[PDB]
């Protein structure tokens, strides 16, 4: 349901994305919807990712603020939002199976 919709949205948006805006690479493990949400929350002025952020906020209802981290521990590799969505898309389709 919401998980298919989240995958649908990520494919829907990868058909550039947040041009000039880099996000942190996410360690995709134990239902890390919070880690994905923490990585994207630092993107400013991008209408294209709003739905994904709201959808992710549905799965992770905890307080998540821009700049402040709790879920994220692996802060080293910085990527394009397109690359991040493609990395999130690989993990999300693995959980769906």
């Amino acid at each position, epitope marked *: 349901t*919401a998980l298919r919709e989240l995958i649908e949205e990520l494919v829907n948006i990868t058909q550039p994305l*947040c*041009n*000039g*805006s880099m996000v942190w690479s996410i360690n995709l493990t134990a239902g890390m919807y919070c880690a994905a949400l923490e990585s*994207l*929350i*630092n*993107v*400013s*002025g*991008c*209408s*294209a990712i*709003e739905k994904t*952020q*709201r*959808m992710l*906020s*549905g799965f992770c*209802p905890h*307080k998540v*603020s*821009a700049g402040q981290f709790s879920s994220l521990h692996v802060r080293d590799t910085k990527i394009e939002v397109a690359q991040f969505v493609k990395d999130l898309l690989l993990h999300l389709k693995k959980l769906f199976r």
Partner: antibody, heavy 118, light 112 residues
Framework: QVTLRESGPALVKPTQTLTLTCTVS????????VNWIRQPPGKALEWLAM???????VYNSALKSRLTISKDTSKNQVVLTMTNMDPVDTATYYC????????????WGQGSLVTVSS | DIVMTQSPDSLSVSLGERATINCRAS??????????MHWYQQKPGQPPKLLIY???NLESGVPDRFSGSGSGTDFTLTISSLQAEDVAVYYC?????????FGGGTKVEIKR
């Protein structure tokens, strides 16, 4: 250190077009969303339009046919035009930037009062 | 087109007393269990200032006496101990659905 500053005429003749400019400093318009809001003296705030950093344009529904929002990333300015100005459009016009997700309007300009009169 | 309606239109409370403001949306401002509604304070001759976002989160630097609550259609802004500097007009606003809309405002005054 993000700042927004509105500029435009203090006075517009009835039926004429108002052109307002919002100059943004400290944030690139390629990743910064700018809103226009107005406030008639002693009345409620009225949201008018916005242009996201990635280009999405949204307008107030009742004033849609009269409004055009645009931007020039080079001069780092957002322009609002409103046609067929009437004395009822006399108001302080504010531009305001969105914060991060959930995208509330966290950064406001001082506002520019526009009077519509002959 | 989500219409935001505030009640009461104005209110007068003693210094150090609890103050409560209400806001009602015409449609739900919820998306995936979160409320896309925000509260602003506007002091005379100044632009509005964000106080609360996502219905209950305090904007950084805003005094802790302010709080927000509610879900779906009904929202509340609360000042635990009204201060002389809290005199202003308070506005609610939604961004759940385009276009963004503001409430009509509520003027808060001190009873002295």
């Amino acid at each position: 250190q993000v700042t927004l500053r509105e500029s435009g005429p203090a006075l517009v003749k009835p039926t004429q077009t108002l052109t307002l400019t919002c100059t943004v400093s400290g944030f690139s318009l390629s990743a910064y969303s700018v809103n226009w809001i107005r406030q008639p003296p002693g009345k409620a705030l009225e949201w008018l339009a916005m242009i996201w950093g990635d280009g999405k344009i949204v307008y107030n529904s009742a004033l849609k046919s009269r409004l055009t929002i645009s931007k020039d990333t080079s001069k780092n300015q957002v322009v609002l035009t409103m046609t067929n100005m009437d004395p009822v459009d006399t108001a302080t016009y504010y531009c305001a930037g969105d914060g991060y997700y959930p995208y509330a309007m966290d950064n406001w300009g001082q506002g520019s009062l526009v009077t519509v009169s002959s | 087109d989500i219409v935001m309606t505030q009640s009461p239109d104005s209110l007068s409370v003693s210094l150090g007393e609890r103050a409560t403001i209400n806001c009602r949306a015409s449609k739900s401002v919820d998306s995936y269990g979160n409320s896309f509604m925000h509260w602003y304070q506007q002091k005379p001759g100044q632009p509005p200032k964000l106080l609360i976002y996502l219905a209950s989160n305090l904007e950084s630097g805003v005094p802790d006496r302010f709080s927000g609550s509610g879900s779906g259609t009904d929202f509340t802004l609360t000042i635990s101990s009204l201060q002389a500097e809290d005199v202003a007009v308070y506005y609610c606003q939604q961004n759940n659905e385009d276009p963004r809309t503001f409430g009509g405002g509520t003027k808060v005054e001190i009873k002295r």
